[PDB]
Structure 1
């Protein structure tokens, strides 16, 4: 008796930026996020009457 085939898988590598989900996001690589304490985005909405 003998073997006929030894078959394995190759894992389908799907990263974040190839998927269409990144249309709902804005991707920035940020070197040292370990050093950040807080983030801040500051709006100023002037309302006409």
Structure 2
């Protein structure tokens, strides 16, 4: 590999060699909750620190019935493929002269 030949080559230089420089204490989160040991901490007990991450949504694609590809295929939904082996269609053409 070495930075190339991979899915999503724009996120190459951002994800790979920038996070090696920065992530020395893992502090890109939003601190929300703390677990103070007891009613009164006195700054001596080990305080737990609860963090919050940042995740984006998966880029959604609406199913192809809104695409005009449905013209190319009549679509009968089918209930058991492990039960059908070899479906078939038979034509019978009478031919005048």
TM-score, normalising length from structure 2? 0.40
Higher strand residue share? 2
Check 1:35–1:7 CA distance in 2 against 1; reply closer, same or farther (3 A cut): closer
Listed as ranges, the gaps of 5+ residues in structure 1 are none
Higher helix residue share? 2
Task: Report what 1:40 is aligned to.
Answer: 88
Larger RCO: Structure 1 or Structure 2 (Cα < 8 Å, ≥ 6 residues apart)?
A: 2
In the aligned structure 1, how far is the partner of 2:61 from the partner of 2:90? Answer: 38
Larger Rg: 2
CA RMSD of aligned residues (A): 3.6
TM-score, normalising length from structure 1? 0.71
In the aligned structure 2, how far is the partner of 1:18 from the partner of 1:8? Answer: 25
- What number of residue pairs does the alignment pair up? 49
Check 1:5–1:37 CA distance in 2 against 1; reply closer, same or farther (3 A cut): closer
